Amino acid sequence: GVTDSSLLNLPAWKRLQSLYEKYGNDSILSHFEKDHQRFQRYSIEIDLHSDDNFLFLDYSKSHINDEIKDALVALAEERGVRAFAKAMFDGQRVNSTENRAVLHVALRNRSNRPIIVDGKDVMSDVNNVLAQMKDFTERVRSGEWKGQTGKSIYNIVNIGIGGSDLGPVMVTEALKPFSKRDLHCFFVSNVDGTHMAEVLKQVNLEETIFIIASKTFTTQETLTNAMSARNALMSYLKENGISTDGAVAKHFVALSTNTEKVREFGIDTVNMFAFWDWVGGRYSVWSAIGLSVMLSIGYDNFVEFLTGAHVMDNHFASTPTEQNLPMMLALVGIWYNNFFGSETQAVLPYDQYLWRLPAYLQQLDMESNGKGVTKKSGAVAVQTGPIVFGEAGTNGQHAFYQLIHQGTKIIPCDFIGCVQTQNRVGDHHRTLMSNFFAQTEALMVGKNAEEVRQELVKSGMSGDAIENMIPHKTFTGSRPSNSILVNALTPRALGAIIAMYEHKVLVQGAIWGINSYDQWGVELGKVLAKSILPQLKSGNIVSDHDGSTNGLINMFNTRAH
Amino acid sequence: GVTDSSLLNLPAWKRLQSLYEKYGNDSILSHFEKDHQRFQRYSIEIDLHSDDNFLFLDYSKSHINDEIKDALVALAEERGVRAFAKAMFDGQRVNSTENRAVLHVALRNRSNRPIIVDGKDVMSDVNNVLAQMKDFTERVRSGEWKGQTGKSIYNIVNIGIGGSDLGPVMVTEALKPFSKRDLHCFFVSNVDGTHMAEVLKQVNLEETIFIIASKTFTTQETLTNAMSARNALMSYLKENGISTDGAVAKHFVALSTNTEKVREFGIDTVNMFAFWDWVGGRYSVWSAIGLSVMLSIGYDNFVEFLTGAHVMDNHFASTPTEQNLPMMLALVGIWYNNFFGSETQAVLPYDQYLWRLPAYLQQLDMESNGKGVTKKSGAVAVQTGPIVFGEAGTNGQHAFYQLIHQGTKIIPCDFIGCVQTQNRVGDHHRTLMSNFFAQTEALMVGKNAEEVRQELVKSGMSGDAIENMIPHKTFTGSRPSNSILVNALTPRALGAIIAMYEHKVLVQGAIWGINSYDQWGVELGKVLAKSILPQLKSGNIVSDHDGSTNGLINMFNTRAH
Numbered sequence A, B: 001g002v003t004d005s006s007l008l009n010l011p012a013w014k015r016l017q018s019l020y021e022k023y024g025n026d027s028i029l030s031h032f033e034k035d036h037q038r039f040q041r042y043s044i045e046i047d048l049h050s051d052d053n054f055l056f057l058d059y060s061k062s063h064i065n066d067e068i069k070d071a072l073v074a075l076a077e078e079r080g081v082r083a084f085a086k087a088m089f090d091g092q093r094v095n096s097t098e099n100r101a102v103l104h105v106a107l108r109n110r111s112n113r114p115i116i117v118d119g120k121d122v123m124s125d126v127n128n129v130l131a132q133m134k135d136f137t138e139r140v141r142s143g144e145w146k147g148q149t150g151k152s153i154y155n156i157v158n159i160g161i162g163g164s165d166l167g168p169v170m171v172t173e174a175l176k177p178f179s180k181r182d183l184h185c186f187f188v189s190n191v192d193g194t195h196m197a198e199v200l201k202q203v204n205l206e207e208t209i210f211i212i213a214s215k216t217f218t219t220q221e222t223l224t225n226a227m228s229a230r231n232a233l234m235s236y237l238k239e240n241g242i243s244t245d246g247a248v249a250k251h252f253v254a255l256s257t258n259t260e261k262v263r264e265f266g267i268d269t270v271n272m273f274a275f276w277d278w279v280g281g282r283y284s285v286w287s288a289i290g291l292s293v294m295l296s297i298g299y300d301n302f303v304e305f306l307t308g309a310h311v312m313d314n315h316f317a318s319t320p321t322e323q324n325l326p327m328m329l330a331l332v333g334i335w336y337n338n339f340f341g342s343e344t345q346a347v348l349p350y351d352q353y354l355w356r357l358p359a360y361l362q363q364l365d366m367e368s369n370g371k372g373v374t375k376k377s378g379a380v381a382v383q384t385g386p387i388v389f390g391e392a393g394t395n396g397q398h399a400f401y402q403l404i405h406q407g408t409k410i411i412p413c414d415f416i417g418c419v420q421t422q423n424r425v426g427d428h429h430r431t432l433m434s435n436f437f438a439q440t441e442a443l444m445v446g447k448n449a450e451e452v453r454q455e456l457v458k459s460g461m462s463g464d465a466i467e468n469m470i471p472h473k474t475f476t477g478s479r480p481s482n483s484i485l486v487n488a489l490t491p492r493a494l495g496a497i498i499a500m501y502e503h504k505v506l507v508q509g510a511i512w513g514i515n516s517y518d519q520w521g522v523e524l525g526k527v528l529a530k531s532i533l534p535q536l537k538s539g540n541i542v543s544d545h546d547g548s549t550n551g552l553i554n555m556f557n558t559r560a561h
Helices: A011-023 A028-034 A066-078 A081-089 A122-141 A163-174 A194-200 A220-239 A247-251 A259-264 A288-318 A325-338 A357-369 A401-406 A428-445 A449-458 A491-512 A520-535 A547-559 B011-023 B028-034 B066-078 B081-089 B122-141 B163-174 B194-200 B220-239 B247-251 B259-264 B288-318 B325-338 B357-369 B401-406 B428-445 B449-458 B491-512 B520-535 B547-559
Strands: A043-047 A054-058 A155-159 A184-188 A208-213 A252-255 A344-349 A387-389 A413-418 A481-486 B043-047 B054-058 B155-159 B184-188 B208-213 B252-255 B344-349 B387-389 B413-418 B481-486
Touching (some): A054 A325, A054 B547, A081 A288, A081 A491, A122 A288, A155 A220, A184 A194, A208 A247, A220 A247, A252 A288, A357 A491, B043 B288, B194 B220, B208 B247, B288 B491, B357 B387, B357 B491, B413 B428, B481 B491
Parallel strands (some): A344 A413, B344 B387
16 A cells, blocks of 8 residues: 555544644643542553562653543554454464464463364474573583583673664673672674684683574575684694594574484584574573573573563553553654654663663664564554663763753653662662662653742742853753662562563554554665675776766775775 | 743744745755756865865755855854854853853864863863873883783773763774774773673773873762772782782873872773863863873874864865855754754764764753753754764664655755775675665655556556555655765764864854753752662652552562662
């Protein structure tokens, strides 16, 4: 088709326009002055079922009354969100354009509810691989696995790209306190072997395993980096006169399905960890792609991380939309992105260990829902995914806060925080949390002309210099925030925060009618680049592009080496 | 006042609305089909005056014809941009709300044009400090400066915050290839001494200097971290039975003006490097705040970095707006931010060394122009600063590109790149640049229904499965990009890229009529936090905030330790 019009003509969507048109300008503060229990009514707490841990969302600091909330839930129902999620959870082929299932929840399906794809239960496979990762990680971490010289392993360099790198990085970072301090992990992803050469002159090769992530195990990009590592290993044994016999098998493993191609590389296929087509890159940490994670925090902590996500999964499947945390999260987001016209979404985690989270979510959210067409194959009638940004609130806790407070863009803010701290050193945590609660307060209440006037008289300010200074120091308030709390950032807690955002992205994509699980958007750039490449040579002039690309390619060609 | 209306009623602004209304929807491609020299006409090259280095902006991939370009330049004239920049450059007090000068250009004023503030030429001071940093850095780097045990120095830990940390980090990262590989630099900024304790068990204290950045030298935040370092030094000498006499003076230096408070700390004031009120935090790397930089790349390379910025300064002061690179950069940005209604600005540097640049620019741009009122003390009538985001194009070179290509938000993209490479290893640079040029091409030209149809027939796709797959794989095109090229990323080149963005922010702020150089926006958050802090105690219930803040503070209080 040409253009959808479907969603644009739902009774629920029109009804939400009217409510935006009518109640849009009411202050966030006004909604609290009416109901003294607004906090409770506009928050959901999930029991995480271990150690008094929990995940809590307070979405009360928003421009949403009960009518608006009612309409948003109506929208989710009218659009079949719950039924779409059930199909996905059952292994139906909801990734319509690639005609495959989307089954990251199978990877953490602790109850082992049989999920049937192409006449087979995929849980034999999930569980088989998990048990294989268990046995392998146990032996690396205990020191029983020995390199070619007889030494235990102290380094893990993971070779991959994009999604197969960002999860493992974010998560092993997020959970350092649970990690074996002893063995260090590196994550190579860049095409030029700068990073690989960096890590090679840092690690003692006798003491290091390299994980090679590649489904086909041919991907020129990561196999080039793999080869550098392999060539260095062979080189290093050669010089120091050590047998190469069985060497690569002792220092390399694969995340792949291509049994014979891995075996050709010199890897032992007992150390090939499979994953499947229905694991999208941005949904893969939970699978064998997470092997460096499990090496780092061990098998039990990985199971906890998986369990966290599964508790999230059950919550999301079983709980009616008013009280369903990822649903509400998605709805308040749709409210800002689709009626307020907010192009962005900040994610501000007040825990230094989560410093990589916002980047992970950029991938997760923007690559899933950064789409221009519906499954039905019409052009979208409405805004889709927002631009995601953010940083950890420990450090700076100001850089761009100036603009969130006094600039002219309403930016939805997810503040994420923990009650408990992984160390009782002074009052560093309290000071941090005082800022955490204070930022969301400041955003909502602001500081009015009269408050500043009363404050500036007290400063003992000139009578005239005061009047023109007032506006500079005022704060509009009425700016939204979500406060997400966890008791403690444990494997299980992290797993639930990740799954929450995943189902948030699910919900939004279903409402907008897009395929959240394909990523066609990268193809053009690649095709044009393979074609530009032969043309980058000394003195070459090109004419087969537009004038800008031509002049750029041509400046490079005449000025290069 | 209440509301400005000034800018909204300029003949130049109204005229730009009409042109947007009329030509807005024309494809970027259409403007090239008319003029076969559009590339040249919509690009500016600055000679950097050394080594065939240059800085070039190609802003041709945009929705701008000649009329629109004429109108944008009219706007800059009608608003007195050039005259405002001249006042700033002359030491006038353009930071109206703080009633001070804004003179980061004095820090790099190589020609030593006298700049007169409060009856004194500030260049005696700039030059005096530069010469003091010269003598000090020369002695650290040569190994002549010895710690309390007689050993040369191999580590520099910089203790600061926010702006006094982000510049030094971005720049020393940007210029590793020019750095002394030998001595390693660390940058502590976080309130809890986690990072400080990390670096303390990493560095051999006998071999390390600590820089303490603080104008008053009392700031509880950084002086707390300073004290940890100082206490560890005293501890460490005590245990190993080494004299403490003169020890702190051998292992600590200050960036401050508070001579006696620094001296009390045990620092020798010959090693107090001053900077001034008219150096804003986000404009400070060029001053004594950049001491770790100069330690790292040495004095000559620092002068080159300064010179790069100064070449930029002269360009910007002397060249008429049509051909004035920072002016044009600011204008195409205003065009997207103020007529298209684009809330964002991506900065995508295709050089791994620049991976910290986008973060630096978030600070620089968002904290300067993330403002809600005019100097005149009216509320702004128009959108101000955009949300800045981005990452380095080496790694991933996809995460969020899906959305820039096929999502529903027009996002202005500054792609930044280099012709020459700091290493001739394989064809890694060409491959990289092929992507660099290809991404901007892909964005403009897109891929139409028929191109995909012709491509999918060739795939040998089913006749019916082809028709509904087409929209998924199409690319609208007509999405803007700026291609910024440099010959090589040297100190001088980096200095010019930073200054360019600084004057870009200058130009936008003058057009919108805001004070780009204050930052009042952080005060509210801090005041509310100092007040929330005494209330974080076990079992405490608060009632003096709104219900959300109350319930959050109260959940924390009942669930904490």
